[PDB]
Amino acid sequence: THVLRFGGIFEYVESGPMGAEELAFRFAVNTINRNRTLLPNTTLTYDTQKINLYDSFEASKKACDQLSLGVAAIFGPSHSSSANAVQSICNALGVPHIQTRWKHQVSDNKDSFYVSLYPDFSSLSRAILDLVQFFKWKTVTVVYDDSTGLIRLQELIKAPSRYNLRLKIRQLPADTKDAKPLLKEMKRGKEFHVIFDCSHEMAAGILKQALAMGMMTEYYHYIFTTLDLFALDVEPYRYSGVNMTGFRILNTENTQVSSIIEKWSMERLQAPPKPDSGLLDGFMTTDAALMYDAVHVVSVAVQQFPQMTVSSLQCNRHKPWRFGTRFMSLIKEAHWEGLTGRITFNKTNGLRTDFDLDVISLKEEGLEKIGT
Amino acid sequence: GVAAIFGPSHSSSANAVQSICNALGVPHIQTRWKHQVSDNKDSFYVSLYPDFSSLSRAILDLVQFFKWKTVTVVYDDSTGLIRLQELIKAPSRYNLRLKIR
Amino acid sequence: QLPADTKDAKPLLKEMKRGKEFHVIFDCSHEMAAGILKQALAMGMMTEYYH
Ligand SMILES: *[C@@H]1O[C@H](CO)[C@@H](O[C@@H]2O[C@H](CO)[C@@H](O[C@@H]3O[C@H](CO[C@H]4O[C@H](CO)[C@@H](O)[C@H](O)[C@@H]4O)[C@@H](O)[C@H](O[C@H]4O[C@H](CO)[C@@H](O)[C@H](O)[C@@H]4O)[C@@H]3O)[C@H](O)[C@H]2NC(C)=O)[C@H](O)[C@H]1NC(C)=O
Ligand SMILES: *[C@@H]1O[C@H](CO)[C@@H](O[C@@H]2O[C@H](CO)[C@@H](O)[C@H](O)[C@H]2NC(C)=O)[C@H](O)[C@H]1NC(C)=O
Ligand SMILES: *[C@@H]1O[C@H](CO)[C@@H](O[C@@H]2O[C@H](CO)[C@@H](O)[C@H](O)[C@H]2NC(C)=O)[C@H](O)[C@H]1NC(C)=O
Ligand SMILES: *[C@@H]1O[C@H](CO)[C@@H](O)[C@H](O)[C@H]1NC(C)=O
Numbered sequence: 001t002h003v004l005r006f007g008g009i010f011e012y013v014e015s016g017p018m019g020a021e022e023l024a025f026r027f028a029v030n031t032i033n034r035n036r037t038l039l040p041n042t043t044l045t046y047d048t049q050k051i052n053l054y055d056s057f058e059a060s061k062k063a064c065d066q067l068s069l070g071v072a073a074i075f076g077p078s079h080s081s082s083a084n085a086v087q088s089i090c091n092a093l094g095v096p097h098i099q100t101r102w103k104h105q106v107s108d109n110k111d112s113f114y115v116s117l118y119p120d121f122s123s124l125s126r127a128i129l130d131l132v133q134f135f136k137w138k139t140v141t142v143v144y145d146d147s148t149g150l151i152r153l154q155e156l157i158k159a160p161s162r163y164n165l166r167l168k169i170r171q172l173p174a175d176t177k178d179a180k181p182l183l184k185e186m187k188r189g190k191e192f193h194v195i196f197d198c199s200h201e202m203a204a205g206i207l208k209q210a211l212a213m214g215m216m217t218e219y220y221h222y223i224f225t226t227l228d229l230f231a232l233d234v235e236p237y238r239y240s241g242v243n244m245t246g247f248r249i250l251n252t253e254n255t256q257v258s259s260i261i262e263k264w265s266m267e268r269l270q271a272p273p274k275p276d277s278g279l280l281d282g283f284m285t286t287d288a289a290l291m292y293d294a295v296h297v298v299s300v301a302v303q304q305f306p307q308m309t310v311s312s313l314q315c316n317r318h319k320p321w322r323f324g325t326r327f328m329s330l331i332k333e334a335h336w337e338g339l340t341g342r343i344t345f346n347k348t349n350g351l352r353t354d355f356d357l358d359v360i361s362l363k364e365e366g367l368e369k370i371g372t
Numbered sequence: 373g374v375a376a377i378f379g380p381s382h383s384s385s386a387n388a389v390q391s392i393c394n395a396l397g398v399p400h401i402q403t404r405w406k407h408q409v410s411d412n413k414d415s416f417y418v419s420l421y422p423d424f425s426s427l428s429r430a431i432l433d434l435v436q437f438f439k440w441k442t443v444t445v446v447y448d449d450s451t452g453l454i455r456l457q458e459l460i461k462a463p464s465r466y467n468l469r470l471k472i473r
Numbered sequence: 474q475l476p477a478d479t480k481d482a483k484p485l486l487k488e489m490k491r492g493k494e495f496h497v498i499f500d501c502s503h504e505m506a507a508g509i510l511k512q513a514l515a516m517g518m519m520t521e522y523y524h
Contacts, residue, residue, distance in 0.1 A: 054413055056391035081409065085388055104407075106384045107449060146410045147454050154450055157460075161473045168464050171457070174410050189464070217520050239483070240517025241490075 007066040007074035008048035024288035028295035053079040063089045070312035076100045094321030116351045117290045123353045125155035144197040145172045183213045200228035204278030227286040233278045244362040293338040301330040379403045428458035
């Protein structure tokens with residue numbers, strides 16, 4: 001009648017409540033319900049459960065609990081261990097499974113009811129590979145942190161088979177934040193061009209230890225992979241003369257979009273985020289930005305189909321959801337220029353391989369856009 | 373009611389049944405290599421297939437007894453690049469020139 | 474000469490970095506020597522080329 005119900009599975013915080021991706025999902029449902037102009041007949045409710053992100057069975061419990069309670073979509077357990085579990089819950093039951101962060105798609109996965117609003121690393125990799133040729137390099141050094149990130153950079157590893165690069169691949173130590181044994185080698189090894197593959201939490205920690213090593217002269221050039229380089233405290237580095245270069249998807253250029261981020265920080269007012277870390281405060285990460293888009297993309301789909309009755313499904317009984325294929329194809333065919341530019345999926349797999357990045361770089365006047 | 377589960381033998385479903393066996397306590401004896409995620413906090417699993425952290429140095433020893441200076445690693449699926457970590461990272465410490473296809 | 478009023482000697486050190494001067498014989502008190510040595514780090518003028 002006037003109610004639809006989205007699911008939700010998030011990490012269980014203990015110290016400091018309501019973590020980062022949970023706020024993005026709550027702020028999105030409240031926004032669409034408030035601004036009545038979009039979707040003007042039904043009100044969205046939510047059933048966010050909280051698990052550990054490294055338990056593929058605690059995820060499978062809370063997935064069937066939301067299926068028994070009755071939902072219309074599950075917005076991702078957001079980690080490669082339990083994402084593959086809840087995806088195959090949603091395939092047998094028929095319910096869509098909107099992911100929000102990249103995982104390893106196995107090449108023979110025969111599932112269909114999933115979309116991935118995080119940009120594919122089959123397209124980010126060629127965006128980096130284009131950017132190591134506009135700068136005309138012949139010797140790079142890919143540094144990653146966990147072993148899954150080597151699958152993230154396939155097209156950059158396979159690149160010296162067709163171009164003139166000379167790859168040298170290193171790995172950060174897994175346990176500590178002390179990568180000074182690594183950087184002493186790279187300073188001595190004459191490697192001035194680095195393509196770091198880290199999260200922005202670990203990218204700030206290397207960028208402080210690359211300053212204490214004196215490896216931040218005007219001879220170096222760091223390309224970061226993460227789409228959160230705009231949220232770095234780059235003020236200790238802006239005068240030195242380095243050229244950090246990264247991509248950026250979250251459109252700050254639009255006034256209608258940057259109004260949301262200004263309205264984001266007022267609920268983020270209760271956050272002293274320990275400013276001795278290296279992260280700017282009051283900025284919304286790109287992982288929370290995609291969850292705010294993922295609610296609106298499905299909200300476009302329910303607008304184009306008012307015949308949804310949220311039924312309750314059993315797991316132990318095997319029966320697909322009767323509005324499955326009708327509602328899933330509307331999600332794969334959608335457009336919504338929300339926070340992160342154009343959201344349009346790919347009809348073959350269901351991923352996102354068509355997006356609009358902004359190449360950002362470091363200058364003395366801050367961290368500025370130099371291309372698209 | 374069993375005492376052990378002898379592996380679903382593939383990287384998609386091995387990670388599922390491993391985390392079934394961790395919460396239930398039952399051992400999970402694997403029999404073929406998968407991608408161990410570096411932050412997996414499970415304990416009830418053994419892997420009788422030899423690790424590719426040790427096969428990789430066995431290959432890297434064998435490309436030096438033959439005294440090579442130019443190799444060409446060819447793999448088939450993308451998981452196999454994680455299989456050969458220590459051979460890709462090798463020209464940072466030796467005199468090889470890797471070309472990966 | 475350092476500016477007399479401020480502790481901001483970044484207009485000075487931008488010239489010395491650009492002027493290729495790698496050898497400096499600073500005459501300061503240790504209160505002001507610590508303040509220049511922090512601003513010589515934010516300018517990136519503390520590589521292994523300087524003395
Ligand atoms: C849905 O998703 C699928 C993925 O499965 C998309 O398919 C991919 O589409 C991209 C489009 O960019 C294809 O990219 C193309 O591949 C080239 C690779 O070079 C090969 O071929 C040349 C010449 O034959 C050889 O020399 C070489 O050795 C390789 O064998 C790339 O060079 C091109 O992409 C990029 O080119 C340059 C990079 O330097 C830049 O201009 C751009 O970054 C450009 O993107 C070329 O476009 C890719 O092969 C497809 N298949 C995959 C990944 O398996 C679908 O397109 C998508 N559907 C949509 C969007 O509707
Ligand atoms: C509430 O929704 C309405 C209807 O969309 C918004 O009005 C326009 O929204 C579109 C995109 O949704 C913008 O491109 C237009 O610029 C908006 N028109 C204006 C600003 O006159 C409205 O902006 C939404 N409310 C808020 C607070 O953003
Ligand atoms: C790498 O470093 C500099 C330092 O940020 C980049 O910026 C230029 O800095 C010089 C200082 O001598 C200014 O005169 C230029 O105007 C700056 N560039 C622009 C576009 O404003 C510089 O762009 C980078 N150079 C290379 C070759 O990568
Ligand atoms: C649904 O919303 C539209 C808005 O244009 C309205 O015209 C229509 O009457 C609504 N349907 C109802 C209230 O059943």
